Amino acid sequence: ISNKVDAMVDLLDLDGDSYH
Amino acid sequence: QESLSSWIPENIKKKECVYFVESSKLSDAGKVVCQCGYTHEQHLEEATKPHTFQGTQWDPKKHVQEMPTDAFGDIVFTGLSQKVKKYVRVSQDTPSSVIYHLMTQHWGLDVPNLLISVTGGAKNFNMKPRLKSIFRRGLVKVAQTTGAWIITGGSHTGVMKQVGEAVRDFSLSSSYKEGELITIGVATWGTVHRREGLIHPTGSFPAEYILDEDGQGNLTCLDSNHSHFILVDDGTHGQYGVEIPLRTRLEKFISEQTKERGGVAIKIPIVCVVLEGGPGTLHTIDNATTNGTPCVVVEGSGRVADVIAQVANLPVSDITISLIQQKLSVFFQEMFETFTESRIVEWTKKIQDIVRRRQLLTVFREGKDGQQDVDVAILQALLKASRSQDHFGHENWDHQLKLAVAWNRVDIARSEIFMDEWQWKPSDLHPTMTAALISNKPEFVKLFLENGVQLKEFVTWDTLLYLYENLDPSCLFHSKLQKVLVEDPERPACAPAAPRLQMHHVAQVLRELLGDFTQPLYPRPRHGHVTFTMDPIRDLLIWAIVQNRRELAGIIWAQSQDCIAAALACSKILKELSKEEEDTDSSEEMLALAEEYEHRAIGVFTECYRKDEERAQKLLTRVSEAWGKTTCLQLALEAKDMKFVSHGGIQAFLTKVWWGQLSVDNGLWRVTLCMLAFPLLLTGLISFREKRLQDVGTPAARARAFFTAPVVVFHLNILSYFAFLCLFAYVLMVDFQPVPSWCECAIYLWLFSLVCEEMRQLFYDPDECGLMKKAALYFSDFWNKLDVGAILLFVAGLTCRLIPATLYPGRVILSLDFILFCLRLMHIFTISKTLGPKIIIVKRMMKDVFFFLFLLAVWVVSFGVAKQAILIHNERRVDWLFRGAVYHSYLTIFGFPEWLTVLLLCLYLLFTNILLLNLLIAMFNYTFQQVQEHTDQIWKFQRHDLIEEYHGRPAAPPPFILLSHLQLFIKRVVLKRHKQLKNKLEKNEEAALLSWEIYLKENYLQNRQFQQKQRPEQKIEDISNKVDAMVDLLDLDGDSYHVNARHLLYPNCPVTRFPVPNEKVPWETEFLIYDPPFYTAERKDAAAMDPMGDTLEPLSTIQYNVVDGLRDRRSFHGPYTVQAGLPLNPMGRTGLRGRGSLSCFGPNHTLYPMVTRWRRNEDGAICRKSIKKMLEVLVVKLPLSEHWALPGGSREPGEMLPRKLKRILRQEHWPSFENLLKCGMEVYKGYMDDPRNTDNAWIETVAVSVHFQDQNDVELNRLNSNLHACDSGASIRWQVVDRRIPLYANHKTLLQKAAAEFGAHY
Amino acid sequence: FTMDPIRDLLIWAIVQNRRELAGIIWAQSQDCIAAALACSKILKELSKEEEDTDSSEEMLALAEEYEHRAIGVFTECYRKDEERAQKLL
Ligand SMILES: Nc1ncnc2c1ncn2[C@@H]1O[C@H](COP(=O)(O)OP(=O)(O)OC[C@H]2O[C@@H](O)[C@H](O)[C@@H]2O)[C@@H](O)[C@H]1O
Ligand SMILES: Nc1ncnc2c1ncn2[C@@H]1O[C@H](COP(=O)(O)OP(=O)(O)OC[C@H]2O[C@@H](O)[C@H](O)[C@@H]2O)[C@@H](O)[C@H]1O
Ligand SMILES: [Ca+2]
């Protein structure tokens, strides 16, 4: 359950000048 | 005390209406009232005289006068309490310095740390029970810790009654605790019921006031719980509200003008708070918030609270006067119809001017899921207000944090106070560390540690003394320390009776708690910057462990120096303390803590054993310098540290001592066989370790090293004792004579040798200890008791054998002696593996079998006397019948006549053969059930002292121990343990050993906390915190006017103006109720200013928007409209008709010059902000302005208008030169917002800015020399520029407008 | 009105083995240490004559809980001020 809810909180937390 | 009673009629005044101006509306049975009607037919306490003018509508400025006050003093309520209460009647206008000097000096109230001013509804107040709960715990809990000053209105009604009750019961329930939550009440002198008894012309040092809740018409009576009383008088009688400006004015002067401890100033923080109110409440909040005190309102509480809390986050322009009465009439639904439009516009104006200043207000929100405290609200209402009030203040940074300690808010203090912008040094956290420690707050000391406070630098000597001065008085150790310190006899001469607390006192109680063997820890002085002890963290550990503070001690153990001594000492102290506790809940926790510390000691030592064993053995035999010159092992012995001594490696150390110089594995039978033959040891018969003795065979050294081992001396003493018994038995059996034999005298010689060995067993003193205590620890031993009983019986028997007339007595006495010696040999079986555990149970069951056997004796005595009385003739023989019946009773106990014989034998069979056997069965079941299996650990703990006693003993069997006694007795005639059980190591060695130890501790701690992370309760807690963060994350998915003009309280002129909302400001919008008073100043009819303050006459003829000669009566912005021959404000409406204190109508033109320069560092380069730079302005402070402001003058003269600001300030002749140099740059011109604006006479300005770019010698040199500044002013000085710097807010607008011209910061 | 109302309601709610109702109305009681012991005495004197194998166990455990409540109040009042707390017995 803890691994499930940590995957859940990870998924919910998921939401130049060119010179010489 | 009489200085007060003289001082009050000198100092304070009180108001007096002097003339009868008879009121038109005659009062309710007070028809003779002259518009105040206090105590006469008139409003007079003197002759109601004509006074040369009977002025109709007698002016309160002109009629009412001041008089010296006599109504002061003390008070008591008749029977309702027993304590006394101070009270003072005070004038309407009084300097707050006077009242502060009174309350400090002549009342004896020290300076506070917090000022809560609570306000609410007085006569008509109703509350839900949930609101009632916060007053009982939230207000009292936050008042009682910080040492607050609850200031409120003094009344017996409503909310003030709730505060009065909720502070009273705390004082009763405190159970004679020190200190009382001081409470000061302020009410008006007019609306007091029975105040005629209070006026005593002399000093009323006693007084009596009886409250009566019957005669309350217009008036109201006092409350009986407030501890000081202040009665503002006004001269009026029934007025409500003459106490608000005095309370608000006094609160500020107390908060921000009295504490200046190391610096400029430091302000005592201050909070106003409301519950539910009406028209008195809004005026109080509005008058308070202009003075800088924050205000927290509570949601879900009452009428005014809800209508403020609904309009909290709204924009300021969004308030409609319709919306006000709409939200008003629903919450005021009892008296909603009692509202008129003028009351609606007044309340709309007040709510507008309050919710403008969003910094100084907070809502409690009534979160109602935890319903946490007032404290979480009050802290944020401090912090938001403190930043806005000042940015350079440092008192709030250190004064605030301390307060945040006392309510246990670590998330707030971490997030808000410890973000940035403090620039603290770490040692500056030292005093606020200390109060975090005494108040037992582990979280804040953990946060200070993670922020970088060093314990080793922190604990000074005097700091430790102060720590012990403030022990928790509930604990047992405080009572024991008090019982010592009161019984301290050597403190004769001092100013007081209770002398002091010195460190040798707590050292003396610690020595008696710890045991006799240690030395005193702290020395007594035989008589700086920072005196340090030998080891600081030891002392703090002792302090935190005597008071049963668990989680605090668990932190500061982790920084300890030498840990294995420390955990065992803290186990010993707790076990010695938990016996004398006598409270059924303290003893269990105080025991389990000691068990946890035993676990910590085992956990460190089992690491250090596994890393390197032979070094880890050196850790036990070390003598610790810290804990009073003892070792670790003896400390573990005295504490009955059962689980510690049964560890494997320490038992291996004990065995390695036991087998001595030779190896440990060669068994016992081979030991007996090499004991049998002398050169068998010289042969390859036995083992050895330390192979220089095993390989290189030096047989003299090998024989000496063989005899040095204590197993050898043990077996030799056993053999000699055995032969002693056998030859003693032979001389006792047949070889006994009245003349002494020779086999007898040899045996008496061997027993003399035994008694001299027991003598040196008693007299040996390795370290100095109590000699009587040495005898006590001797005689506490079981086998010592048996040995001394045997020797005293022996010398008594030898005395009896020296009597030839008692030979058969004396001989059999020496028999009984023999029996004692037999039990001595049972001592041998303690050393076995398998028998000692059984011997323990015998030593157990002796204790109750004794008290059983006494009962058996009384039973058999009763039986014997009964049988002797029933079955004999009447006889009194000496030893015939009594001894015959005693032998018959011994035959019975060791193993018509028909009915009586059957009755006697059946009584014997039912009694002595049955029930006491069942007592024995039950008692020994209860005994043997209890022993369980602990017995092996009891034996392993019992193993040590035998090895000790044989290690100390000399090597000879006791016929030859005299050879040992002679050399030791002659060495102690002329002028120290062995170095295998206690040795003082090299200092250089001990440093390396302790560093190795303190390395290994941190390796223990990680495994400890990591496996503590695997308990399931920890996992459930982590899952709950995860899902609460998850539900929080998922739950996550105005019109600019002249607002300083509309603001009330026209300065230096006690008048008012009309309430004007944000709607009816401009001249375009019609306001049908707009009726401002035609207000003029007293100096509006005066000198060279225009006399048109009373321009209803045709005297108003000067030029409008044109220069009427020297009066350039023309705006820089544009042409003002004229109505009824007077100009109107082009900006809108202000609420006051007339000229006011201004010179003339329209604009009154003035020039505001500002000087600017750069702020350099110590080098001379520009100091830098985050992006911009630092700027300096030169400002003035007048002696009666209490404010810094710009040196700007009225432009009534042409060029000397800066000299009209600064003739006295700048110079006289060089001032005209700098005025020639004053050709600078202009930033802003036109109409200016100001509180001195009516609808007619406003202020227009021109603003010039002159600058110093170079900060060396140039234009600035002329400003330096051309300065005669000290003319008629208090102070002028240069000043840093920032957005928080003190000034008029009107001038702050000028600086924030002109700071863009040079790019300074903000 | 009677001499003390909440006493009577406590008696009524405790003779009928209503647990969670009695636990509420104990909290408003007047003199609590007498009340918890009286309600323990009534339950122990009643649970003997019950003769139902399921009612007697709950009717006994309730009395044990009320003994716990009396101890819990008295150990507070002892710790605050001992010599006044002796006057309570
Ligand atoms: N100082 C007073 N003492 C007792 N009663 C009062 C007082 N002032 C007003 N009252 C009565 O209270 C009634 C209205 O009470 P509310 O509107 O609930 O309270 P409010 O008038 O807002 O008074 C706020 C009160 O709090 C105090 O800090 C302050 O002295 C102010 O008077 C009125 O009928 C009035 O007679
Ligand atoms: N824009 C403003 N912002 C704040 N306060 C103001 C402003 N304009 C005037 N005041 C206040 O109004 C009060 C009366 O105004 P003036 O006396 O006309 O102002 P000024 O002449 O600059 O000050 C005279 C000073 O001499 C002292 O006797 C007196 O204490 C006052 O500080 C003063 O105390 C001043 O502090
Ligand atoms: Ca002995």
Side-chain angles (χ1 to χ4, degrees), chain B residues 172, chain C residues 75 78-79 84:
Chain B
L172 305 187
Chain C
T75 186
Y78 191 46
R79 203 197 314 277
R84 202 150 68 152

Side-chain angles (χ1 to χ4, degrees), chain B residues 905-906 909-922 924 935-966 968-972 974 977-978 981-1016 1018-1020 1023-1031 1033-1034 1038 1040-1062 1065-1067 1069 1071 1073-1074 1076-1077 1081 1086-1088 1091 1093 1098 1104-1105 1109 1113-1122 1124-1130 1132-1133:
Chain B
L905 283 175
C906 81
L909 184 49
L910 76 90
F911 276 133
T912 197
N913 297 104
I914 302 299
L915 88 171
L916 74 168
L917 313 186
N918 320 332
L919 181 150
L920 286 190
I921 284 175
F924 298 150
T935 177
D936 42 1
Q937 290 193 358
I938 301 163
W939 169 69
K940 291 157 83 67
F941 181 73
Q942 273 291 143
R943 194 167 150 189
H944 154 69
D945 45 353
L946 178 58
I947 307 184
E948 171 69 33
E949 180 198 33
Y950 271 79
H951 183 93
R953 184 212 297 271
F960 324 110
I961 210 63
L962 300 189
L963 193 142
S964 71
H965 266 78
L966 55 88
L968 301 192
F969 201 80
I970 65 163
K971 188 251 295 179
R972 196 174 69 186
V974 284
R977 302 267 188 86
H978 279 153
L981 268 183
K982 183 184 81 168
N983 48 358
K984 194 158 183 68
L985 278 77
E986 294 291 326
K987 170 254 303 172
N988 170 50
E989 175 54 54
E990 202 166 6
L993 196 65
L994 288 184
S995 48
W996 179 50
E997 182 51 63
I998 206 168
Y999 190 81
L1000 259 294
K1001 169 164 67 69
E1002 86 178 11
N1003 202 1
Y1004 162 74
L1005 271 176
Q1006 294 181 359
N1007 310 344
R1008 173 159 208 268
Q1009 66 97 41
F1010 152 77
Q1011 72 95 15
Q1012 269 200 0
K1013 216 188 286 299
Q1014 301 318 111
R1015 298 182 327 276
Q1018 191 53 245
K1019 294 188 144 313
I1020 305 170
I1023 287 177
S1024 47
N1025 305 356
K1026 266 295 183 316
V1027 77
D1028 290 356
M1030 273 275 277
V1031 78
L1033 176 57
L1034 199 49
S1040 189
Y1041 300 126
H1042 39 277
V1043 302
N1044 217 313
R1046 291 183 292 173
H1047 157 60
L1048 210 62
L1049 290 87
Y1050 199 91
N1052 221 319
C1053 169
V1055 295
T1056 173
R1057 72 184 80 194
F1058 199 88
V1060 184
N1062 283 351
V1065 270
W1067 295 115
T1069 319
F1071 196 38
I1073 313 170
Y1074 194 57
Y1104 288 165
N1105 54 60
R1113 300 154 63 101
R1114 153 211 67 255
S1115 156
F1116 284 81
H1117 192 103
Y1120 42 80
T1121 182
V1122 191
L1126 320 176
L1128 288 193
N1129 186 6
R1133 289 181 193 90

Side-chain angles (χ1 to χ4, degrees), chain A residues 3-9 11-12, chain B residues 1030 1033:
Chain A
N3 305 356
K4 266 295 183 316
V5 77
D6 290 356
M8 273 275 277
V9 78
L11 176 57
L12 199 49
Chain B
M1030 273 275 277
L1033 176 57

Side-chain angles (χ1 to χ4, degrees), chain B residues 98-122 124 128-129 131 134-135 138-145 147-167:
Chain B
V98 166
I99 308 186
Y100 188 69
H101 167 261
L102 167 72
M103 282 176 307
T104 42
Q105 295 319 293
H106 312 331
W107 271 358
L109 314 180
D110 77 307
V111 69
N113 289 322
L114 188 48
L115 276 81
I116 294 182
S117 67
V118 62
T119 181
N124 46 186
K128 11 225 95 193
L131 243 250
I134 79 84
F135 264 15
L139 193 150
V140 141
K141 176 290 296 292
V142 301
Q144 75 100 12
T145 76
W149 274 28
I150 296 188
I151 173 168
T152 176
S155 174
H156 207 284
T157 66
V159 185
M160 298 83 93
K161 192 193 198 149
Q162 285 309 301
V163 175
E165 58 86 18
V167 77

Side-chain angles (χ1 to χ4, degrees), chain B residues 323-332 339 342-345 347-352 354-365 367 370 377-385 387-388 393 397 399 401-410 412-414 417-418 422 424-427 429-449 451-455 458-459 461 463-468 470-473 475-482 484-485 489 492-493 495-499 501-511 513-515 517-525 528 532-533 535-544:
Chain B
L323 157 69
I324 296 305
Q325 49 89 42
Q326 174 261 330
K327 191 64 67 67
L328 173 137
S329 294
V330 55
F331 281 101
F332 280 67
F339 282 87
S342 62
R343 290 221 299 152
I344 288 302
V345 68
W347 282 28
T348 304
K349 165 70 211 294
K350 269 203 200 326
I351 287 180
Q352 198 74 274
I354 286 169
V355 305
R356 167 188 326 281
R357 289 154 280 162
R358 296 178 186 271
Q359 283 308 291
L360 271 296
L361 190 145
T362 312
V363 69
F364 175 58
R365 190 43 71 211
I378 298 167
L379 206 43
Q380 314 184 294
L382 253 305
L383 291 181
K384 304 199 6 242
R387 261 164 344 211
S388 253
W397 284 158
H399 213 97
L401 169 69
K402 161 187 306 175
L403 185 142
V405 162
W407 303 334
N408 201 7
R409 298 300 165 187
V410 289
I412 305 301
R414 175 204 319 278
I417 310 169
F418 278 159
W422 199 13
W424 70 96
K425 61 191 292 186
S427 68
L429 300 187
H430 281 169
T432 179
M433 158 67 79
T434 292
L437 220 52
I438 313 182
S439 175
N440 200 1
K441 312 300 292 312
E443 201 42 67
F444 271 118
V445 68
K446 187 183 301 161
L447 193 132
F448 296 157
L449 260 299
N451 213 67
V453 183
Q454 308 270 20
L455 266 302
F458 164 66
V459 191
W461 176 268
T463 314
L464 180 66
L465 185 58
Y466 174 73
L467 260 290
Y468 278 106
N470 316 134
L471 300 171
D472 182 23
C475 77
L476 176 55
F477 182 72
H478 181 241
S479 44
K480 297 170 69 70
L481 174 59
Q482 286 311 314
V484 162
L485 196 54
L501 179 57
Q502 309 299 101
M503 289 311 289
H504 49 64
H505 295 288
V506 66
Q508 171 167 10
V509 69
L510 258 176
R511 197 212 208 277
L513 196 148
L514 199 48
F517 49 87
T518 179
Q519 293 177 3
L521 278 87
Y522 307 102
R524 164 161 310 148
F532 275 66
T533 180
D535 176 39
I537 321 170
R538 185 263 314 277
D539 302 331
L540 190 53
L541 187 51
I542 294 308
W543 177 91

Side-chain angles (χ1 to χ4, degrees), chain B residues 183 241 916 1144:
Chain B
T183 290
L916 74 168
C1144 46

Side-chain angles (χ1 to χ4, degrees), chain B residues 118-122 124 152-157 160 186-188 191 219 221 240-241 244 247 277-282 284 303-304 332 347:
Chain B
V118 62
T119 181
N124 46 186
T152 176
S155 174
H156 207 284
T157 66
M160 298 83 93
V186 166
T188 176
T191 80
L219 318 177
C221 185
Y240 272 154
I244 301 168
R247 168 165 54 166
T281 295
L282 269 305
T284 284
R303 29 191 206 261
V304 155
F332 280 67
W347 282 28

